[PDB]
Every structure is written in structure tokens, then in C-alpha cells.
Amino acid sequence: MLLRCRLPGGVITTKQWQAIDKFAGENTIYGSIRLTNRQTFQFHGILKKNVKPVHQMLHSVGLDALATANDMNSNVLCTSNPYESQLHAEAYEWAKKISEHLLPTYLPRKFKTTVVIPPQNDIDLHANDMNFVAIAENGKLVGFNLLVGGGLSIEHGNKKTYARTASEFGYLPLEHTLAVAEAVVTTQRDWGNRTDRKNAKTKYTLERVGVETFKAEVERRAGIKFEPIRPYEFTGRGDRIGWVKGIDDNWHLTLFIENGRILDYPARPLKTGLLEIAKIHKGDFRITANQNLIIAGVPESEKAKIEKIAKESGLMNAVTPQRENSMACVSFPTCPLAMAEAERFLPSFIDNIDNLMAKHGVSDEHIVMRVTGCPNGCGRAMLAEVGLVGKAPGRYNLHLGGNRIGTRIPRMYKENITEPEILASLDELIGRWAKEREAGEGFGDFTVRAGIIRPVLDPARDLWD
Ligand code: SRM
Numbered sequence: 001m002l003l004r005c006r007l008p009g010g011v012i013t014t015k016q017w018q019a020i021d022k023f024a025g026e027n028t029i030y031g032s033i034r035l036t037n038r039q040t041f042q043f044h045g046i047l048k049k050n051v052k053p054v055h056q057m058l059h060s061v062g063l064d065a066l067a068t069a070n071d072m073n074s075n076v077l078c079t080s081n082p083y084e085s086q087l088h089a090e091a092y093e094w095a096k097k098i099s100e101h102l103l104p105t106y107l108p109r110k111f112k113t114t115v116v117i118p119p120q121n122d123i124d125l126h127a128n129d130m131n132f133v134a135i136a137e138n139g140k141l142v143g144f145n146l147l148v149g150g151g152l153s154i155e156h157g158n159k160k161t162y163a164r165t166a167s168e169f170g171y172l173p174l175e176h177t178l179a180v181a182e183a184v185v186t187t188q189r190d191w192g193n194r195t196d197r198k199n200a201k202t203k204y205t206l207e208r209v210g211v212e213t214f215k216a217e218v219e220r221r222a223g224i225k226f227e228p229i230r231p232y233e234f235t236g237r238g239d240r241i242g243w244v245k246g247i248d249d250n251w252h253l254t255l256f257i258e259n260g261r262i263l264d265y266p267a268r269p270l271k272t273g274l275l276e277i278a279k280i281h282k283g284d285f286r287i288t289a290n291q292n293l294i295i296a297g298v299p300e301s302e303k304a305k306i307e308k309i310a311k312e313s314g315l316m317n318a319v320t321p322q323r324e325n326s327m328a329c330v331s332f333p334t335c336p337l338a339m340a341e342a343e344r345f346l347p348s349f350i351d352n353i354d355n356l357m358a359k360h361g362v363s364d365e366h367i368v369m370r371v372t373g374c375p376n377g378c379g380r381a382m383l384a385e386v387g388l389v390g391k392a393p394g395r396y397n398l399h400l401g402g403n404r405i406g407t408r409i410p411r412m413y414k415e416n417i418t419e420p421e422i423l424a425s426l427d428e429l430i431g432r433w434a435k436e437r438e439a440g441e442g443f444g445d446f447t448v449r450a451g452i453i454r455p456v457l458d459p460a461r462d463l464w465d
């Protein structure tokens with residue numbers, strides 16, 4: 001009553017798309033395709049009499065499922081829509097090679113990997129065990145900076161667990177990629193706590209043995225030494241909504257899809273619309289880490305046709321920049337672990353945020369805002385500027401003071417409060433931000449500067465008050 005696909009970098013062909021669309025419509029309870037924030041999709045509610053057919057369905061189109069509940073390598077992410085458009089094909093092959101390499105290894109806990117192309121951190125690297133930050137010379141990849149040990153999951157009240165950002169190890173030439181990957185996984189495989197699984201994650205291993213220790217083991221195993229980190233900088237995590245020009249006669253249309261939930265709604269047939277686009281589209285689709293969908297590699301001759309369908313089906317309905325940069329995990333009704341609503345709470349909650357933004361003259365700005373149903377953190381609220389972590393039905397821990405690019409964990413500001421309390425708080429603070437902020441200053445960075453909340457400087461030690 002949940003299936004997830006292995007889909008490195010979120011790249012899926014249109015022939016594949018027609019297959020999963022058919023199956024979701026006819027052989028699941030919910031009848032939907034659910035885009036995940038790890039660039040793949042899920043079915044919800046598969047009857048046991050259809051579990052066999054679904055793997056047969058995937059295989060017939062060259063796809064394969066991920067086992068959700070094993071301690072394995074999860075979907076490998078890859079920046080979906082790089083500003084340097086040409087870089088994508090390469091980055092993607094490496095995401096694919098790494099994904100295949102790490103197939104059956106057998107770990108203390110699930111292992112999470114990304115290929116990142118600056119200046120975008122859409123894939124949200126600091127949530128991940130192992131990150132390859134691409135370095136390019138003249139439109140060709142030369143190497144990667146390696147960042148190890150991100151992970152967001154916590155347990156309420158439990159100061160022995162914590163979200164942690166990933167750590168810089170150094171730079172490696174393209175050619176050692178697979179040896180470094182394997183070195184990191186096997187090092188974690190060997191040193192990771194196998195008794196307590198809420199302490200097995202790489203982030204805990206690193207804090208137990210030290211960064212330098214873990215890094216030296218990896219050099220030893222990979223047969224290399226790391227060079228110093230090479231320059232890179234991030235400007236955002238958002239998707240690029242609408243048309244963007246690729247290379248040559250190539251255009252990408254990124255469709256905003258609230259909670260990545262693909263279904264036919266009243267006056268908005270999202271599912272039927274994407275099926276029809278899939279039927280005529282020359283290239284393929286890309287599932288983003290923001291739970292959106294890119295119709296990729298559209299020739300300029302084909303733009304009006306594609307856009308007519310998307311438009312008619314409600315796929316291109318204008319939403320605020322605030323809504324484009326908000327996210328929620330699945331939670332109820334399907335998640336057995338859910339504490340508070342997340343996906344089903346987000347749309348109305350953001351309507352209220354939209355009103356507050358408008359109330360303060362900042363309807364054109366945005367705050368990276370995320371809701372997660374429980375402290376497992378799937379919604380990545382623990383890298384948000386404003387994070388809501390579900391604690392019970394209708395109640396959330398409110399976190400403040402991450403930043404736009406997702407390199408700082410937000411500290412808990414208020415605990416176990418309800419939506420009206422949350423809104424009243426944010427009304428106050430957004431008002432202060434609108435009036436007192438320096439030019440271009442983000443809301444997260446502001447709360448910190450103005451002493452509204454203390455920054456989280458050393459997660460393992462100062463996350464918890
Ligand atoms: C769909 C998704 C959220 C979303 O709306 O997109 C999701 C959904 C669930 N996550 Fe997740 N996680 C999703 C990204 C994440 C990420 C964010 C990321 O990877 O970018 C995290 C936080 C980062 C991290 O790993 O720390 C995350 C941390 C977890 C955890 C906590 C793991 C831990 O280290 O403690 C669990 C529970 C567990 O396994 O212990 C979990 C468990 C779950 C399960 C499978 C619940 C379960 O174990 O029974 C969820 C299924 C709910 C449902 O019915 O659909 N999910 N989950 C993401 C699917 C990812 C994918 O395609 O493979």
C-alpha cells in the first residue's frame with residue numbers, strides 16, 4: 001500500500017510515464033502519482049492482488065522498485081535544471097553510475113547520495129550522507145567536492161539525536177568518483193553503530209570518530225588524497241517555474257505541482273493533462289527535488305502545443321513565489337508514522353501565509369517554509385528558514401533561522417503550538433522583517449541577526465536548548 005521507483009536524477013521517459021499513469025489510475029486505491037522530494041514517484045494503496053503486476057509493469061518499461069524499508073542506498077539525486085544547461089547530461093550519467101554501483105554493501109541505515117551543480121541546492125545536499133558537488137572547466141566536469149554526513153531525522157525531546165549538515169572533506173578528480181563513493185559507504189558500513197538504529201546514520205558516526213579520522217580512512221580506502229576544497233557557492237534551492245531556455249533549440253517547462261500530487265481535480269485535470277503531454281512530447285520528464293515536474297528538451301516548434309495542454313489542465317496556474325518555495329511530506333492518510341497533517345495542511349496554511357505576506361508588503365518575496373508530519377523530517381523542515389515539525393494532531397514545533405540556501409539548521413522557537421498560534425507568531429515576525437531588514441536580507445538570516453532566535457552553530461552540541 002505504497003510503492004516507490006528507483007529513478008536516478010528523476011529522469012523518466014514518456015513511454016514510462018504512460019505506463020505508471022495507467023497503473024496508478026486502474027490498480028491503486030488513491031489513483032494518484034505522487035512525486036517525492038527525492039526525485040522519484042510513489043503509488044499509494046496497491047491491493048495485494050496487484051503487487052505482482054506492478055513489478056511486472058515496471059520491468060516491462062525498464063524500471064525497478066526501491067525497497068522502502070531496507071538499509072540501502074536511496075534514490076540518488078541530481079540537480080534537475082542547471083543554469084549551466086550543458087552540464088546536466090554528464091552530472092546525470094554519474095548519478096546513474098553511482099546509483100548502479102551502490103546496488104546489491106549492507107548498512108547500519110539507509111544511505112543518501114546526491115550529485116549537485118552549483119549554484120543550485122535544489123537537491124538539498126545537507127540532508128544527505130554523501131554529496132558530490134560538481135566542478136566544471138569549460139562546460140566539462142573535471143571533479144567534485146565531497147560533502148559527507150548530512151541528515152535531518154530527530155526524535156522529540158531526545159537530545160542524543162539531531163539534524164546535522166554535511167561536512168567538507170575536499171576535492172577529487174572526476175576519475176576517482178566511484179572509488180571515493182565506495183570508500184565512504186564501506187567506511188560507514190564498518191564504523192556505523194549497528195545496535196541502536198537511531199544512532200546508525202553517518203552523521204552520528206562522524207561525530208563519534210571525528211571528521212578528520214573518517215576522512216583519512218576514506219583516503220586510505222580510495223587510494224587518494226583529497227585536494228583542498230575548490231570554490232563553489234549557492235544562490236538558491238527553488239525550481240525555475242515556467243519556460244527556461246536550454247541549449248540550442250531546447251526549452252524546459254517546469255510545472256508547479258502542489259505536494260507533487262498528480263490527480264484529476266475539479267477544473268484541474270493534472271493527471272489527464274500530463275498523460276496527453278506525455279503522448280506527444282519528444283523528450284522526457286524530470287521529477288524535481290521540490291516535487292515538481294519538468295517537461296524537458298522541448299523544441300521551440302513544440303512549445304505552444306505543450307503549453308496549451310498544461311494551461312488547459314490547470315498545470316500552469318499562477319501561485320505566489322511563497323507557494324513555489326514551500327513543501328510538506330506525505331503524512332496522513334497513508335503514513336503509519338504521521339503525528340500531524342503535512343501535505344493536506346499545506347495548501348490552506350499557505351493561503352494564510354499569502355495573506356500575511358500581502359499584509360506586510362512582501363507578496364513578491366518568499367521564505368523557504370516547510371512542514372513535516374513527524375520528526376523523521378521527510379519534509380526537510382530542519383533545513384527551512386521556517387520549519388514546522390508535527391508533534392500531535394494539529395500541533396507543531398515551530399523552528400526559525402535556517403537560510404535560503406539550506407546550510408543552517410533552524411533552532412526550535414516555540415513548542416507544541418497550533419496553527420492560529422503559529423500564524424500570530426509569524427504575523428509578528430514577518431512584520432518586523434518587512435520593516436527592519438537590510439537590503440536583500442532573508443527572513444531566516446534576519447531572525448538570527450536581530451536576536452529573535454539563536455543560530456545553530458554546532459548541531460551535535462548546540463541544537464537543543
Ligand atoms: C515521500 C517522502 C516525503 C515526500 O513527501 O516527498 C517520504 C516519505 C516517507 N518517509 Fe522519508 N520520505 C521522503 C524523504 C525523506 C527525506 C528527505 C530527503 O531525503 O531529501 C528524509 C529526511 C532526511 C534524512 O534522511 O534524515 C526522510 C526521512 C525518513 C525517516 C527518518 C530516517 C532516519 O534517519 O531516522 C523515516 C523513518 C525511518 O526509516 O526510520 C522515513 C520514512 C518514510 C516513510 C517511508 C514512512 C515509513 O517508514 O513507513 C514515508 C512514507 C509515507 C507515505 O505513506 O508516503 N523517512 N524521508 C520522501 C520520499 C523519498 C524518496 O523518494 O525516496
Ligand code: SF4
Nearest residue numbers: 329331335373374378
Ligand atoms: S515525516 Fe514523519 S510523517 Fe511526514 S512522511 Fe516522513 S514519516 Fe510520515
Ligand SMILES: [K+]
Nearest residue numbers: 235236237238
Ligand atoms: K530560490
Ligand SMILES: [K+]
Nearest residue numbers: 257259290291
Ligand atoms: K511541489
